[PDB]
Amino acid sequence: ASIREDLEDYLHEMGEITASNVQNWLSGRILLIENLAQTLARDHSPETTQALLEQPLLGSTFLFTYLGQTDGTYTARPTSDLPADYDPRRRPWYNAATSAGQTTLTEPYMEPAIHELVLTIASPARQGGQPFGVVGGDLSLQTVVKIINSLDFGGMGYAFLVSGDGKILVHPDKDQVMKSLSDVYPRNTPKIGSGFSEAELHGNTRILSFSPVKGLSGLDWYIGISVDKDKAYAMLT
């Protein structure tokens, strides 16, 4: 009975190493948003706000870096054509940073300017006590998925980012973004947890593991790993 399933050890290690890569990837990028939010606290004048958002280290980092203020003032670099009714305080990155009260990440949404799926690192900007706005920075979803799948598999498996309640955040399949884990596998579903789960894909049988992304205070995000069950048993010696 050679039913030794190290596959179980492989999935839960690849899941944590991938989670650590995403954990380390957001390190510097959250650091850039915080340093910007802390700098706009001591001076948020329009001339200083303009030149603060034009530094090249933010240009090569985020698609858009911006500050939405409590009175509705909006400043963003690079400049883009936004809807006429654009109000930053009614945007998800404003509510996410406000409701979280700290540096947080938004669920993927549709960029209004370039019409591409993005994620925002939004941090509240406070002069101490009362806040005056929210600093944000957009990350292209195609860039994020590549970090999720930085580790190589044998074409048997892929990695994706799913939230705690089961909402898929980034997935290599562009149409399955923001779908629920229940919406993907109709036959009764896997659930986030320690255990491995077995479900069926489109003409394929998959095994799923879940390793949480630590370090993100307040965000219970998990790195999911679907692997082709039959393909997964590549035996050695």
Ligand SMILES: NC(=O)CC[C@H](N)C(=O)O
């Ligand atoms: N032009 C911009 O800076 C857009 C900001 C961001 N994409 C938003 O959803 O508001």
